[PDB]
Design an enzyme around this catalytic site. Sequence first.
Site, PDB file in Angstrom:
ATOM      1  CD  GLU A  14      -2.769  -0.715   2.656  1.00 51.19           C
ATOM      2  OE1 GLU A  14      -3.471   0.304   2.826  1.00 51.19           O
ATOM      3  OE2 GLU A  14      -2.628  -1.603   3.525  1.00 51.19           O
ATOM      4  N   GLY A  15       1.948   1.228   0.813  1.00 49.61           N
ATOM      5  CA  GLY A  15       2.928   2.300   0.925  1.00 49.61           C
ATOM      6  C   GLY A  15       3.598   2.616  -0.395  1.00 49.61           C
TER       7      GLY A  15
END
Lengths: 593, 590, 102
Positions: free
Chosen positions: B197-198
Amino acid sequence: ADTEKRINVGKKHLQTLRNLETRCHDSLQALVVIDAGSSSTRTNVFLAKTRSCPNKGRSIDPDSIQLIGAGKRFAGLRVVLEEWLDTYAGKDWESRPVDARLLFQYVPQMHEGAKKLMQLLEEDTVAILDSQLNEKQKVQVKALGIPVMLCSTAGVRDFHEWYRDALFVLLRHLINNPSPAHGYKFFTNPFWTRPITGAEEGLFAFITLNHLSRRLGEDPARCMIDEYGVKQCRNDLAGVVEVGGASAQIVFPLQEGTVLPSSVRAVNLQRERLLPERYPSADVVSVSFMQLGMASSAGLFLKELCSNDEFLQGGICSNPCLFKGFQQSCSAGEVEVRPDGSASVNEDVRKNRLKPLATYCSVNNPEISFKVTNEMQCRENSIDPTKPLAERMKIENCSIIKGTGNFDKCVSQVESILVAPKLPLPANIEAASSGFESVDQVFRFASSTAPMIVTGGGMLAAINTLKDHRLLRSDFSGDVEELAEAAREFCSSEVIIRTDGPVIQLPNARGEQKLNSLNFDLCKTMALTVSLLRHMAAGENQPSFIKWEKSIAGPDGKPLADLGWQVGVILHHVLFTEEWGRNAYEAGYSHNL
Amino acid sequence: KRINVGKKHLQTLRNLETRCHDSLQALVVIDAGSSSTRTNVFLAKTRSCPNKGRSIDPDSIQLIGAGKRFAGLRVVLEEWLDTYAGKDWESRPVDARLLFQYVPQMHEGAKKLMQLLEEDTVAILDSQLNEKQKVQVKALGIPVMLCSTAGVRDFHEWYRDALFVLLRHLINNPSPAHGYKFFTNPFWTRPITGAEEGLFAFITLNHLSRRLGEDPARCMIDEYGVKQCRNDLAGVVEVGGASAQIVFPLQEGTVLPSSVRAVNLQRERLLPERYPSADVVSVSFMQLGMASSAGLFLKELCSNDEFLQGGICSNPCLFKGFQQSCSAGEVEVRPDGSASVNEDVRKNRLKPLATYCSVNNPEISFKVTNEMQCRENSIDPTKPLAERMKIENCSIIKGTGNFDKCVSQVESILVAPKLPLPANIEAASSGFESVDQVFRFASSTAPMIVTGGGMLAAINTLKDHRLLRSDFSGDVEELAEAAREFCSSEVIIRTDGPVIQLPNARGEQKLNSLNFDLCKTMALTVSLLRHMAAGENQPSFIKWEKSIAGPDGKPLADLGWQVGVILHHVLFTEEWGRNAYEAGYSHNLE
Amino acid sequence: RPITGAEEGLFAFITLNHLSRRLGEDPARCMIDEYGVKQCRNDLAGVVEVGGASAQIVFPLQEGTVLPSSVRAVNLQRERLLPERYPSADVVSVSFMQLGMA
Ligand SMILES: Nc1ncnc2c1ncn2[C@@H]1O[C@H](COP(=O)(O)O)[C@@H](O)[C@H]1O
Ligand SMILES: Nc1ncnc2c1ncn2[C@@H]1O[C@H](COP(=O)(O)O)[C@@H](O)[C@H]1O
């Protein structure tokens, strides 16, 4: 506790779903090849199995390709331009000089002419799909898009202005704009829709033959180690003799360990982008003879035979290739055998069988001024390039042609005029052509042991006619003397007029058949066949066998597709996986909005 | 002459058959988070070129609508487990193999959610597209990328993977009535980790802001005369519900300590080779998400003698006048002013940390120190689930509104703990253990963008009360001064409900379930900024953003992982062309 | 150049597999995967090498196994230890500085 049974049902259900998202999916696709010949334009509808694989895209299984319908023979592409030139340049265009620049005013008028024909081909294509496909198949075919391959063979290549290529731009615009009411997603591009040469037609016919007979495939038939230590692999391919209306093609594999003279070259199908690299290397002798077409050979034969003092006396040309009792007007014009028993000769310049050769032999246009031998070859055939068209095609000091039905004289003249002329027509050096100039030169210098398949409706008619009358055995395998003795009997037949029309009456009360427009001059085709077989027999290397085929039987015994260039054209696009995937699926019909 | 009209007509028709053709495509990203599932509809310009196929122009990716928040995917699984495994499944051992009897029932739960998402996606396409755009959009097919984040990561049986098989099956069978050709495959529809996600959020930021491109910003010549090029990328700080992500470019001319690693985007198959090499510091912390930090903060603060006295836990991050029962359970601010604490194991903010910090989890079995790192953070894997999340000798949590004491507890519990929770080591992460370590050992000059609903609400709240200037650019003392004043507000019960009454009668706002503990987020912001300021290298600038406006000043798309997920697919031209166009929706025929 | 303990293990694994005729262009078995793509591997032997400074353990990753995300399989082609023509080799590679003789 049958709890274990219902646990496994759940496990297998999930496995069935996992397999469905990881495996390849098959979908049917329709493919259309429009055969735009010299005197007709016809649709050819094919089906193929496409395979869609995760992270690999979509491809066609080439072995799945099958013809589902051959359409109505509509007007030749030539007719669109002839009619456009008749209305806007004046009916006098075939003789009088025309300023091509002025014709750019009539571009949407040319577009309309081509629209009429394309609507008729589109209508006929839609008819074939609707009549041959079930509702499930129609869903697959409508969703995938329908690539269209329109290829003009002869007729169109003879205009020599901007008209020809402009017509193609217009045909593609029409193909890419089909009516939405039927739902079939027809589409094309300049790589699929374009004219092809006689030489390219031969290579496509070679590919078709070899695919249908299953000789061509990724797996090599035999491998060999060369002088350097590298494994050299090949398929066991068969050669093809294809006699069409405008030309005859001879394409066969190059004999292993043969080194051709510097002036000629083997055509490498991989180098020419006809076969991908994953297929065994294919080096072929490729030859296209413009004077050996059914129509062009008929025109040249008359021009040359009827200018020979042995055959022409007091305005009467004695033709050894025509039946005793047959008579026609002295010209290379198109012949109609009337129920009356007589022959009607169409004197129209447009209908003259010498027209392609006479347009090729002119001062105003090509190679004639270039090489001295080129102008020398035209004058030899009594066609002096300095004269107007009508005069060039005219058979001088000749009123009628009478048949003498003498097969040996017919063979001798076919040999002298068509097969081994004193001065051959210029050698064709395009990429698809090996650069040979005559049949003798092919079999003297580049003969091969590869089997040969003889094709073309006229060639098969010549053999089947003899078989039909029990002059040739059904097991006939290509023996020259057998053929010559059979044709000598048939060709000495008399034209007899009966109430039901004219008949070819065989000697020794052997029987008869109706005399018609298609069979009146078939003895010239029997003589051409005798001559070709003799030149093949004289070769250092002999074909392992010779067969006459109209069709190739498939795995079920039923022919998958027909012999000709159509299959070969599909293959040379379809076999290039990445390029086909990009053009047919990524760009697709959505490229047209 | 009318000849030039004819000559032009043929030349334009010729150009038409040789040139590239543009056509519009819709792309769908379903954001399957822990609390919610929401569709995100995007538009893109495709270019079809002779002999070259069809590709997407990445600069054309635009958000056209973010839909409704439907129930989390976790709810599908919880309800199916409550029925088929029994109500006590979270606290008792379950035989997963018997559940293979209930695969159609799991499909039935997934189907209701997928139908709602499909209808909402179609409503967005119908409200945003004109009739001409619809024709193009309907023809090309609609790639769907359903990505789950938090919520489904912790089931640890055959269930999650099986649910994903069912979701792709559902996506691959859309309603034929609307004409929208939705389709997916296992490469597009899959779960994603917090560290992933990062990386996608970092790609979204850099793409939308036009920092990420084929042409480099700077190069350095190596010993062999070879150019070593980079783009001028910005870093991201993303605080979501379940985790917090920190991703930024590795400081130039540096090499990290050998026990941690730089994440390379080209190596991870996220960016193609034609893009300059992107080496990043990548960090994902489960304990720094809004929900998890709230649970752990209470678990550690209310177990300390300074804060727990006579069964009363004095919380400095809560307002004076605020009171709740002692638990890490979900808080509901009631109309009567009172706080309603949900005691359900399912509604405990500590449940995801409790699941990670369990003997069942092989994650704490691999590394020996992991069990100890859990136990020392008051999440004992040896204790049963309910006992593991329980705050002992505590009946009431009372707010004291002391901002500095709140910051110092945020430092000791969340940012710079004496012993951090086990560090996350995965292909997408660098292996850092804490925020303190990130900025002490791997600080960068790259500008930083702070994102997430809670982080931005904390800054907006102070701006709306005129405690922070509108042009606030990240100054630590300006923030601490504004938050200190706001956090000393008293909670007053009124006939209309509870209010946060600011000092010196400088305003009020409604007290609710979403904002009652917002001072901890302010403290986290001050703490994070202090750590970034003390770094050897400081970010060139710091901004709080939710979206990036396009070249026309109009909003292009929102910040987050969605745009980056699209890009990691669309940027790999040949693979994309085969999957989206050659196979396409026609892959689902029969 | 200097080599690390972990690289020394990879080099020793290659030596063993070359000499025992396990490593080569000819795979020992090829498995048709879930997509229908044949994935060729050599039947490689693992090595336990105990040196003076460290001990190395290198062996092929178990077929069809998913390692924890906290550890990774070393791919020899990716590390440019083995060329592409050689069947793909994924190994568990470890070097323990505390297990050396000295
Ligand atoms: N039965 C036939 N008898 C004589 N000529 C034919 C016959 N069938 C086809 N032809 C001619 O042979 C050439 C090639 O025909 P096809 O192989 O049918 O394309 C053309 O000039 C046709 O007019
Ligand atoms: N307006 C808000 N006020 C306070 N907390 C919020 C607000 N919006 C979002 N949050 C919190 O921030 C988390 C991430 O939000 P979002 O970026 O919308 O996914 C949510 O899960 C909430 O805990």
